[PDB]
Ligand binder design. Structure first.
Ligand code: SF4
Lengths: 106, 175, 140, 312, 191
C-alpha cells in the first residue's frame, strides 16, 4: 500500500536504508581502490550429503514455519498432524544417525 | 508498487537470459540468484510475502547453495565444453529458440482474451497460509514430508562416496 | 648402486664441492641475475616437476611441495593418503664444518653453539671435550 | 515545499541513517572491546588509525581470478548481516522495517550469508582456501538448519513474525525462562552462522585446507571483519528482542535499556570466547545435528502442547 | 630535515627537500595518513632458524604490510625471501633481526647471502646475536617515527607519485652523550 502515510514512511526508510548500506559498501570499496598508491581432483560426497540434509530439513522446517503462525488458530488436530510430521522427520533423522551419514570421522 | 513489479520482472527476464547464454557456470548461478531475488521482489509486489520469503530462504538460500556446493566440489569450471562454444552458433541456437518462441507466441495468445479484475492489494499473510496448509491440506504436508524423505534417501543412496578422505581424484569408475 | 644420488645440502645447480680443500670457504659476490634464475625456477618448480630426479614412482598420485625450522617436503598423494615423500633439506645449511676448517680451536665455540640453538651449551660440550682429548687436558 | 508528511518521512529517513551509523559504530566498538578485554586474561583511536591504514593501501586483484565475485563476496558478508538489523526495534517509534515477515527476513539474510564464504572460496584461486571455504560452508549450513526451528519456538509462543508483536507478547514474562532450550540453540546457531570463535578456522584440523580469509588484502578483508562484527551485534540484538524484554524496563528509557542489554550480551559473548576452548570438527557436526535439531523439534512440540493446553 | 626520493637495490636515489614546503589541507591529511600507518602496524614474522624463535617470546602475508627477517640468509631461501617480499603490497617496511640479516653475520661462507640488504631494501636494522624482544620493540618505535615522518603518494591518480624517506639522525650520534657519559659498571663477579 502507498496511502497510509506511516507505513509508506517505513517503506521509504527501508528502501533508503538498503540503498545507503549498499552505497556505503560501494564507496568503502571505491575508497580502498582509489587511495593508497600503486607500485584431476574432487572434494568428496559428504559435503553434498550435509548440504542435501540442509535443504531437505530446510523444507521440512518451512512446513513448521507455516505451522507456527497458525498454532493457536488451528486446534488439536493441527497439533496431531504436526506431531506425526515431526515424528517421521525425527525417524528419518535417527535413520541418518544410525546408518552413519551424519558423522564425519576424520 | 507496480513499478517495482515491472522492474523486478524485467531484470528477472534479463538475468535468466544471461543464465541461458553464459559460459562459466558460477556467474550463471550468480545471475540465477539475482533472478530468484527479482522473482521474490515480484512475489512481494503481489502481496505474496510468504512466497518471496520462501524464495530467498530456500530457493535462493538452499538450492543455489547446493548447486554452488557441487560446482566448487567437483571443481567444474565449464571446461571441455566452453572451448567448443556450441551454443554460440546458429545451427544449434536458431532451431530450439525458434521452437520455444513458437511455444511462447501460442501460449501468450492463450494468455490474452481472459477477463482481468487486476491484481489488488490485501497481502496474503503467512498466518492464512498456515491455516489453510494445516486445514484442508493435512495430507499435503504429510505426503510432502514423505516426498522429501524419499528424496533424501535416494540422494544418500546415490551420492555417497563409500571411499575415505576429504580429497579424492577423478579415478575412472572408482577402481 | 645408489638411488637418486644428488646434492642434499646445496641445490642441483651448484658447480663445485664445498668440503673439498680447494673450494674457497668465502661468500662470493652476490649477483641478482642468479637469484632471478632461482626465483624463476621456484615459479616453475611445480610446472616442470620431474619425479625421476627425486626418486619417485611415476591417476590418483598428486605431487605437491609442502612448505623447528622451515623445510619443504615433497608428497605423493593417493587422494589424501600419502604414499611417498622425500623431505627436501639443506635450506638451513650454514657450513659449520667448512668454517671448522677455517676458525681456530678457540674461535669455533660460537659456531658449536649455533648448530642447535635450543641446546647451545650442550652442543659446545662435545667440541670442547674432543679438543681437550686432542690437547691431553684432564679438567678438574 | 515543506509539508508535515514530508517532514515525517524525512525524519524517518534520518532515523534510518542514524541507526545504521550507530550499528556500524557499535560493531567497530565490539572490535575494539574484543581487542581490549582479551589482553587482561583512550585507545579507541587505534581503530580509526587501522581504518586509515586499510583505506590507504594498494589493493590486490589476483591475476588468475575474476573481479566481480571476488569483490562481491565482502559485499555479501557485510550487507547481508547489516540489513539483518533492519527488522530489530530499539524503541516504540524507532524501527525502520515494520514488515509482516519480521524474522523471516533475518532467515533470508542468514541464508544469503553463506554465499560470501562460497564466492570467496571459488574466486580465491587456491585449492586449500577452497577446501576451507567448503568446510566453513558445511559448518554454517549444518548449524543454520535449526536456526529457523529455534526461532519458531518464540514465534509459536507469540503467534506472529512481527517483532513488535514479539515485544508486546513479552509484556508479562520474558521468553528466556519458558524457552531456555530455544535460547541456547539460537545462541549457538547465531555464533556458528556468524563464524565466531568456537566455530572458527574449520581448516585447523587439516593441512590441505586453508582459510577463505586469505588472498584478500586491505579493505576486502576489513569488510569481512566488520561484517562479522555487525553480524554478531545484530544477533545479540535479535537474541535480546526475541528472548529477553525488547526495550522493556522499569525506570530507564527503552532505547537505553535495549542498548544496555545488547552490550550485556556482547560482554557475555566476550566471556564465552574467553572460556570455552575450540572443539574439533567431528563433535561440531555431531552436536549440531544430533543434539541440536531433535532438541529444538522437541522444544517446538512441547511449546505447542503448553500453549494449546492453556487455550482460553 | 631533508629526504631521499624514490621514483619510477640498483635504482638511483637523490637527496631533496620535502614537497610539503613549497597547501594546508594536504599537510594535515598526510599527517593523519602517516599517523594511521604508524599506529597500526601489522608484522609478518618470517620463520627462520634462531632469531625467529627468539622473537616468539616477544599472520598471513599481504595483510601484514611489514616483514621482519630473522635468521640467516641462505642461498636456497633467498629466492623465498624475495618472492615473499614481492607478495606484500606497498607500503611495506623491513626490519632485520640479528647480525645474519644485517650482514653475513658470523657466516661469511659459500652458502650464506650477506644479509637481505643485497636484494631487498631494509628500513630498520637490529644488530647482534639474538636481540632481546625489547630491542625489537624499540626498533618498532624507531620505525614508527620513521613512518610518521614520511611523504608517500596519497593516491595513484592525483599527486606526486614518489616516496620520500626521511634522513633520520643515526642512533649512535643521538645517544652519543648518554653512552660516552658512563663512568662505572657493576663487576662481573656477582649477579
Ligand atoms: S644473529 Fe644469532 S640467533 Fe640470530 S639468526 Fe644469526 S646466529 Fe641465529
Amino acid at each position: 500500500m502507498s496511502t497510509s502515510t506511516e507505513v509508506i514512511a517505513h517503506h521509504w526508510a527501508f528502501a533508503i536504508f538498503l540503498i545507503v548500506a549498499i552505497g556505503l559498501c560501494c564507496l568503502m570499496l571505491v575508497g580502498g581502490w582509489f587511495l593508497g598508491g600503486r607500485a584431476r581432483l574432487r572434494l568428496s560426497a559428504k559435503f553434498y550429503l550435509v548440504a542435501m540434509f540442509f535443504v531437505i530439513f530446510d523444507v521440512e522446517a518451512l512446513y513448521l514455519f507455516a505451522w507456527s503462525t497458525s498454532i493457536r488458530e488451528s486446534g488439536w488436530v493441527g497439533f496431531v498432524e504436526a506431531a506425526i510430521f515431526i515424528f517421521v522427520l525425527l525417524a528419518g533423522l535417527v535413520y541418518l544417525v544410525r546408518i552413519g551419514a551424519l558423522d564425519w570421522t576424520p | 508498487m507496480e513499478f517495482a513489479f515491472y522492474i523486478c520482472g524485467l531484470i528477472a527476464i534479463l538475468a535468466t537470459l544471461r543464465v541461458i547464454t553464459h559460459t562459466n557456470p558460477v556467474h550463471a548461478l550468480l545471475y540465477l540468484i539475482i533472478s530468484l531475488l527479482a522473482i521474490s521482489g515480484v512475489f512481494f509486489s503481489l502481496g505474496a510475502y510468504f512466497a518471496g520469503a520462501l524464495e530467498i530462504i530456500v530457493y535462493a538460500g538452499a538450492i543455489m547453495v547446493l548447486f554452488v556446493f557441487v560446482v566448487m566440489m567437483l571443481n567444474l569450471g565449464g571446461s571441455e565444453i566452453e572451448q567448443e562454444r556450441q551454443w554460440l552458433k546458429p545451427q544449434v541456437w536458431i532451431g530450439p529458440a525458434i521452437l520455444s518462441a513458437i511455444m511462447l507466441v501460442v501460449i501468450v495468445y492463450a494468455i490474452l482474451g481472459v477477463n482481468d479484475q487486476g491484481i489488488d492489494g490485501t497481502p496474503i499473510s503467512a498466518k492464512a497460509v498456515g491455516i489453510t496448509l494445516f486445514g484442508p491440506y493435512v495430507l499435503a504436508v504429510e505426503l510432502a514430508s514423505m516426498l522429501l524423505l524419499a528424496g533424501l534417501v535416494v540422494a544418500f543412496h546415490v551420492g555417497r562416496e563409500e571411499r575415505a578422505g576429504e580429497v579424492l581424484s577423478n579415478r575412472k569408475d572408482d577402481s | 648402486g645408489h638411488p637418486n644420488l644428488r646434492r642434499i645440502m646445496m641445490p642441483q645447480t651448484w658447480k663445485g664441492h664445498p668440503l673439498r680443500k680447494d673450494y674457497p670457504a668465502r661468500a662470493t659476490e652476490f649477483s641478482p641475475f642468479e637469484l632471478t634464475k632461482a626465483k624463476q625456477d621456484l615459479e616453475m618448480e611445480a610446472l616442470t616437476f620431474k619425479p625421476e630426479e627425486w626418486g619417485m614412482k611415476r591417476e590418483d598420485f598428486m605431487f605437491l611441495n609442502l612448505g623447528h625450522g622451515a623445510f619443504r617436503i615433497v608428497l605423493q598423494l593417493d587422494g589424501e593418503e600419502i604414499v611417498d615423500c622425500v623431505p627436501d633439506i639443506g635450506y638451513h645449511h650454514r657450513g659449520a664444518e667448512k668454517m671448522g676448517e677455517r676458525q681456530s680451536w678457540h674461535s669455533y665455540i660460537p659456531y658449536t653453539d649455533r648448530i642447535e640453538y635450543l641446546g647451545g651449551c650442550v652442543n659446545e660440550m662435545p667440541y670442547v671435550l674432543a679438543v681437550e682429548k686432542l690437547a691431553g687436558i684432564t679438567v678438574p | 515545499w515543506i509539508s508535515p508528511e514530508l517532514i515525517e518521512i524525512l525524519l524517518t529517513i534520518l532515523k534510518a541513517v542514524v541507526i545504521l551509523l550507530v550499528v556500524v559504530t557499535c560493531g567497530a566498538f565490539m572490535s575494539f572491546g574484543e581487542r581490549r578485554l582479551l589482553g587482561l586474561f583512550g585507545g579507541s583511536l587505534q581503530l580509526v588509525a587501522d581504518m586509515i591504514k586499510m583505506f590507504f593501501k594498494e589493493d590486490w586483484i589476483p591475476k588468475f581470478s575474476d573481479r566481480v565475485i571476488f569483490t562481491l563476496a565482502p559485499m555479501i558478508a557485510f550487507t547481508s548481516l547489516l540489513l539483518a538489523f533492519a527488522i530489530v526495534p530499539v524503541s516504540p517509534g524507532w524501527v525502520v522495517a515494520d514488515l509482516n515477515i519480521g524474522i523471516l527476513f533475518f532467515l533470508m539474510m542468514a541464508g544469503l550469508a553463506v554465499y560470501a564464504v562460497l564466492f570467496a572460496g571459488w574466486s580465491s584461486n587456491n585449492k586449500y582456501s577452497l577446501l576451507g571455504a567448503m568446510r566453513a560452508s558445511a559448518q554454517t549450513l549444518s548449524y543454520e538448519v535449526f536456526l529457523g526451528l529455534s526461532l519458531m519456538g518464540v514465534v509459536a509462543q507469540a503467534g506472529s513474525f512481527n517483532m513488535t508483536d514479539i515485544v508486546n507478547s513479552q509484556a508479562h514474562v520474558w521468553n528466556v525462562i519458558p524457552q531456555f532450550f530455544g535460547f541456547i540453540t539460537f545462541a549457538i546457531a547465531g555464533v556458528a552462522v556468524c563464524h565466531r570463535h568456537p566455530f572458527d578456522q574449520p581448516e585447523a584440523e587439516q593441512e590441505l585446507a586453508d582459510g577463505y580469509h586469505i588472498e584478500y588484502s586491505g579493505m576486502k578483508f576489513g569488510l569481512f571483519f566488520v561484517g562479522e562484527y555487525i553480524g554478531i551485534v545484530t544477533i545479540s540484538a535479535l537474541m535480546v528482542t526475541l528472548f529477553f524484554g525488547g526495550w522493556q524496563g522499569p525506570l530507564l528509557p527503552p532505547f537505553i535499556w535495549f542498548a544496555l542489554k545488547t552490550a550485556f550480551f556482547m560482554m557475555m559473548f566476550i566471556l564465552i570466547r574467553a572460556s570455552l576452548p575450540r572443539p574439533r570438527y567431528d563433535q561440531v557436526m555431531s552436536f549440531g545435528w544430533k543434539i541440536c535439531l531433535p532438541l529444538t523439534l522437541i522444544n517446538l512440540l512441547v511449546t505447542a502442547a503448553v500453549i494449546l493446553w492453556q487455550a482460553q | 630535515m631533508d629526504y631521499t626520493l624514490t621514483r619510477i637495490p640498483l635504482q638511483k636515489q637523490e637527496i631533496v627537500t620535502d614537497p610539503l614546503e613549497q597547501n594546508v589541507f594536504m599537510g594535515k591529511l598526510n599527517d593523519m595518513v602517516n599517523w594511521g600507518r604508524k599506529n597500526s602496524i601489522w608484522p609478518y614474522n618470517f620463520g627462520l632458524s634462531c632469531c625467529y624463535v627468539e622473537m616468539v617470546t616477544s599472520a598471513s602475508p599481504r595483510q601484514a604490510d611489514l616483514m621482519v627477517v630473522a635468521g640467516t640468509c641462505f642461498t636456497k631461501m633467498a629466492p623465498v625471501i624475495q618472492r615473499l617480499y614481492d607478495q606484500m603490497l606497498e607500503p611495506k617496511w623491513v626490519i632485520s633481526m640479528g647480525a645474519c640479516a644485517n650482514s653475513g653475520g658470523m657466516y661469511d661462507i659459500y652458502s650464506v647471502v650477506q644479509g637481505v640488504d643485497k636484494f631487498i631494501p631494509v628500513d630498520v636494522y637490529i644488530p647482534g646475536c639474538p636481540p632481546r624482544p625489547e630491542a625489537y620493540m624499540q626498533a618498532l618505535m624507531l620505525l614508527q617515527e620513521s613512518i610518521g615522518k614520511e611523504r608517500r603518494p596519497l593516491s595513484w591518480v592525483v599527486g606526486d607519485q614518489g616516496v620520500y624517506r626521511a634522513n633520520m639522525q643515526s642512533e649512535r650520534e643521538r645517544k652519543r652523550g648518554e653512552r660516552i657519559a658512563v663512568t662505572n659498571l657493576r663487576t662481573p663477579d656477582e649477579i
